[PDB]
Design a binder for this molecule. Sequence first.
Ligand SMILES: N=C(N)c1cc(-c2ccccc2)c(CNC(=O)c2ccc3cc[nH]c3c2)s1
Ligand SMILES: N=C(N)c1cc(-c2ccccc2)c(CNC(=O)c2ccc3cc[nH]c3c2)s1
Ligand SMILES: N=C(N)c1cc(-c2ccccc2)c(CNC(=O)c2ccc3cc[nH]c3c2)s1
Ligand SMILES: N=C(N)c1cc(-c2ccccc2)c(CNC(=O)c2ccc3cc[nH]c3c2)s1
Ligand SMILES: [Cl-]
Ligand SMILES: [Cl-]
Ligand SMILES: [Mg+2]
Ligand SMILES: [Mg+2]
Ligand SMILES: [Mg+2]
Ligand SMILES: [Mg+2]
Lengths: 5, 5, 229, 229
Amino acid sequence: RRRQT
Amino acid sequence: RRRQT
Amino acid sequence: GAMGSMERASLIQKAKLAEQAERYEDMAAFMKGAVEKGEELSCEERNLLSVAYKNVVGGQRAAWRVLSSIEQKSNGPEVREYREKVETELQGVCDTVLGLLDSHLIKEAGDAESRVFYLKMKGDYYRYLAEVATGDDKKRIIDSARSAYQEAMDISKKEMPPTNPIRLGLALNFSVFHYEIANSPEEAISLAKTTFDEAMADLHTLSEDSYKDSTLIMQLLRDNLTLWT
Amino acid sequence: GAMGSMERASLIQKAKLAEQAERYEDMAAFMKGAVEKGEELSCEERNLLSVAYKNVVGGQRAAWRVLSSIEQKSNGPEVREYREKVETELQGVCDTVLGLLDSHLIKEAGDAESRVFYLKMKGDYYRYLAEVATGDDKKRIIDSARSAYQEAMDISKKEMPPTNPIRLGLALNFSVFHYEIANSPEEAISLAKTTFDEAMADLHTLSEDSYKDSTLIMQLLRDNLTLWT
Ligand SMILES: N=C(N)c1cc(-c2ccccc2)c(CNC(=O)c2ccc3cc[nH]c3c2)s1
Ligand SMILES: N=C(N)c1cc(-c2ccccc2)c(CNC(=O)c2ccc3cc[nH]c3c2)s1
Ligand SMILES: N=C(N)c1cc(-c2ccccc2)c(CNC(=O)c2ccc3cc[nH]c3c2)s1
Ligand SMILES: N=C(N)c1cc(-c2ccccc2)c(CNC(=O)c2ccc3cc[nH]c3c2)s1
Ligand SMILES: [Cl-]
Ligand SMILES: [Cl-]
Ligand SMILES: [Mg+2]
Ligand SMILES: [Mg+2]
Ligand SMILES: [Mg+2]
Ligand SMILES: [Mg+2]
């Protein structure tokens, strides 16, 4: 998964 | 549903 | 210009990069540039052209439908103004594509496969114009779509097998034209059904890979028949 | 211009229409126009500004990452050229946003809530610049992001409860800054954990609706901690 912002 | 093209 | 200084091959390469990046406006501008080099387009290149403008106009049409629905419920000038803005931009894209087909993709298409491809596109982009048309030229716009689709059908029936994916996609779209543009739902249903059945009866001639290509589009015909009946 | 002739209220109304139509470039241009009217922005209007440019730059960053990955594997000029094209367009959007913040949203923000909002944005758009930076100013770009984020953190800690959604989103993004821009993964983890725990201990003060707002962002902090540890 891609880190979230 | 929407018809398809 | 603005793509006139770039090599044809570089434009094609960048169109493929833009597709991978989901940058469809860029993709379309690159393919417009490639067409304007004046050489005929390959099958792969024709598909790149169609995919790019399909996605650009697809976003515009989806936005137009949202705004048109809001405008209908509202019936200040802002909703109409902004719907008109999107509509005008949409019409410009359709005019650009039709201009590439008329200058000079269609007249230089000396194969059934290429000519049918481009005439289908011509019918599609007149159809998108018809979706938003309301004035003195809606009927002429509709007939221009019908005429382009009909000539494509005539050629495809003579020169292409009933399972050819371009022939199937042409028939699918002409059927939707009939249903929701020409107010001819029985024509639409008849065409979808005959196209489906004649492709089914030709599947036995196909390789496994051609079979997948054809049945994919057959399923779209079946989806529409299920929705309409 | 090009939005100088349109009423402020009409620009806001059309920004909301553009959002419903998923026309984020239009949304951003409308909100740029609204900002340039020179009046301070409301909470709702600040959110419209942030959403519009978030989505515009989001698409550009996603395309840049695709092309950068292709370019890295390839190591003709076409891949670099097209990556540079997207990068340059991305940098232009970031410069535009930073220009709106500097002229004159930040200096006119005489509330903690508004000032923190805009300083967070300033850190975000310097961070997006840092993602693509490689030359003599990468370090200055990185410090400009850090400085903006840090001042926002200082104000938010003094003037906002630990569950405030803008404070939480600020901390989430500053933590990601630390992890992947500043190469400070332990700072990133420490900040995410402390922010999560201090918000958890303040949830008992909240209404059901504020509770939903805060826990939504707390889950993003937890997602990152799960990814990083
Ligand atoms: N870059 C692209 N997007 C394509 C390049 C080539 C190509 C590559 C080499 C030689 C000839 C053609 C394509 C041919 N396949 C299709 O068009 C296709 C496939 C599946 C579906 C489902 C709905 N429509 C479809 C269209 S698509
Ligand atoms: N005679 C045929 N049946 C084909 C010849 C070539 C071909 C032609 C020239 C060079 C290389 C390949 C094909 C692949 N091309 C396509 O465009 C295409 C387009 C749409 C769809 C939808 C599902 N699949 C699709 C494939 S299909
Ligand atoms: N048009 C818009 N997009 C908004 C208008 C207003 C508004 C309307 C009236 C008064 C004040 C603010 C918004 C306030 N809610 C959020 O920002 C929000 C909500 C959920 C999530 C999840 C991740 N981020 C989020 C942000 S968003
Ligand atoms: N003190 C507070 N907690 C709030 C005051 C107002 C408010 C302020 C002025 C007028 C009307 C409402 C709020 C709604 N606005 C937001 O922007 C917002 C932004 C981001 C997220 C993410 C999840 N939910 C969100 C809400 S939250
Ligand atoms: Cl408008
Ligand atoms: Cl380029
Ligand atoms: Mg040449
Ligand atoms: Mg009009
Ligand atoms: Mg006024
Ligand atoms: Mg550069």
